[PDB]
């Protein structure tokens, strides 16, 4: 469980590896995988789609059940659903969607949810479909999260860019 290998240490609690998050979840057996979600837990085309695919759509049903009972999340919030065959738990976290005019400051609120979990495997919130700059998302991650976060960046060119950007310390 939580057997992370091959990561680059960026800070005492932020680690980064060039890897697909769904394949890492399977090799590492993490307690908490982070989904980059929207407030209706409708799992579209990024990390959320891939996690859902790997659970054979179980995440989507469970999500709708959760949404039916509880209603939609706030931007910058989270919920703890099941991780199914990927992890013990899946932390659904809703970053701001800047393509839809939401406030980038809420990215800090989004990453604060990580601090309720000792250890997580996560992607870079809001950095794909939601339109935030990956480098910014990484900066907020570094400055906000205090627990152990292992970041999976599947694009080798973005990994290289991200690391180079972090060295402007
Ligand atoms: N399989 C993957 N593994 C690792 N990183 C990934 C993967 N797919 C995408 N990424 C990276 O994770 C970051 C977040 O991308 P998204 O998943 O699109 O996250 P976000 O921008 O928060 O989009 C939220 C929206 O996407 C929908 O899937 C979701 O339902 C919500 O509507 C980006 O750097 C993206 O390149």
Numbering used by the authors: 3 to 171
From the paper:
Severe acute respiratory syndrome coronavirus 2 (SARS-CoV-2) and other SARS-related CoVs encode 3 tandem macrodomains within nonstructural protein 3 (nsp3). The first macrodomain, Mac1, is conserved throughout CoVs and binds to and hydrolyzes mono-ADP-ribose (MAR) from target proteins. Mac1 is essential for pathogenesis in multiple animal models of CoV infection, implicating it as a virulence factor and potential therapeutic target.
In this study, we determined the crystal structure of the SARS-CoV-2 Mac1 protein bound to ADP-ribose. Our crystallization experiments resulted in the same crystal form (needle clusters) from several conditions, but only when ADP-ribose was added to the protein. The structure of SARS-CoV-2 Mac1 complexed with ADP-ribose was obtained using X-ray diffraction data to 2.2 Å resolution and contained four molecules in the asymmetric unit that were nearly identical. The SARS-CoV-2 Mac1 protein adopted a fold consistent with the MacroD subfamily of macrodomains that contains a core composed of a mixed arrangement of 7 β-sheets (parallel and antiparallel) that are flanked by 6 α-helices. The adenine forms two hydrogen bonds with D22-I23, which makes up a small loop between β2 and the N-terminal half of α1. The side chain of D22 interacts with N6, while the backbone nitrogen atom of I23 interacts with N1, in a fashion very similar to that of the SARS-CoV macrodomain. N40 is positioned to make hydrogen bonds with the 3′ OH groups of the distal ribose, as well as a conserved water molecule. K44 and G46 also make hydrogen bonds with the 2′ OH of the distal ribose, and G48 makes contact with the 1′ OH and a water that resides near the catalytic site, while the backbone nitrogen atom of V49 hydrogen bonds with the α-phosphate. The α-phosphate accepts a hydrogen bond from the nitrogen atom of I131, while the β-phosphate accepts hydrogen bonds from the backbone nitrogen atom of G130 and F132.
